[PDB]
Amino acid sequence: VNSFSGYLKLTDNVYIKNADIVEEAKKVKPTVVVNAANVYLKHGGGVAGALNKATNNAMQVESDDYIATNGPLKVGGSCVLSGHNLAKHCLHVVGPNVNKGEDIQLLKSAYENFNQHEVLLAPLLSAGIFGADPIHSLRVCVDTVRTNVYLAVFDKNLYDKLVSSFL
Ligand SMILES: OC[C@H](CC1CC1)Nc1ncnc2[nH]ccc12
Ligand SMILES: [Cl-]
């Protein structure tokens, strides 16, 4: 039993809700919140900009030190950093950005990072400003993630389409 509330159950392990991931994280304080990161951990917009803003830029400060030490992530890769005031940990995961021409096949590799964590609050990877089809992202999530994932989402209209079209 966990403290996630109001989610629709899609499969044994995947749950979904129309919600603002910032507000969800602040309420639940999950062990792991997933950020929709880029390889430079530059948290400008979308989920990343919103999460970073909620940390008063502490996420960006920590991220800049991470990059200075380790260099950029790989598309499809991830790193674990602090969750600041939002969660114990933040798993920064880089899905392919279609608006940069990146290979959508890398979306499965991106979701594989979730399997290293028993429970996660997460957005749909590569959706929103990353330019992928969210119906596809949800399908890849369900077919790749085996741990317990709580998908937040932001767009109410999009949520209804994802539910009604789910196979
Ligand atoms: O595919 C991720 C999704 C995509 C379209 C809704 C823009 N973005 C978000 N999902 C959940 N919470 C969020 N908070 C801020 C942004 C955000
Ligand atoms: Cl977005």
UniProtKB/Swiss-Prot annotation:
Catalytic reactions of this protein? Thiol-dependent hydrolysis of ester, thioester, amide, peptide and isopeptide bonds formed by the C-terminal Gly of ubiquitin (a 76-residue protein attached to proteins as an intracellular targeting signal)
Activity regulation behaviour: Inhibited in vitro by GRL-0617.
Query: For the Macro domain, which residue ranges apply?
Result: 1-167
Query: How does this chain sit within the bilayer?
Result: Multi-pass membrane protein
Where it sits in the cell: the answer is:
Host endoplasmic reticulum membrane
According to its UniProt entry, what is the function of this protein?
A: Responsible for the cleavages located at the N-terminus of the replicase polyprotein. Participates together with nsp4 in the assembly of virally-induced cytoplasmic double-membrane vesicles necessary for viral replication. Antagonizes innate immune induction of type I interferon by blocking the phosphorylation, dimerization and subsequent nuclear translocation of host IRF3. Also prevents host NF-kappa-B signaling. In addition, PL-PRO possesses a deubiquitinating/deISGylating activity and processes both 'Lys-48'- and 'Lys-63'-linked polyubiquitin chains from cellular substrates.
Q: How does it assemble?
A: May form homohexamers. Interacts with N protein.
Name listed for the protein in its UniProt record:
Papain-like protease nsp3
Q: Which organism is it from?
A: Severe acute respiratory syndrome coronavirus 2 (2019-nCoV)
Name of encoding gene: rep
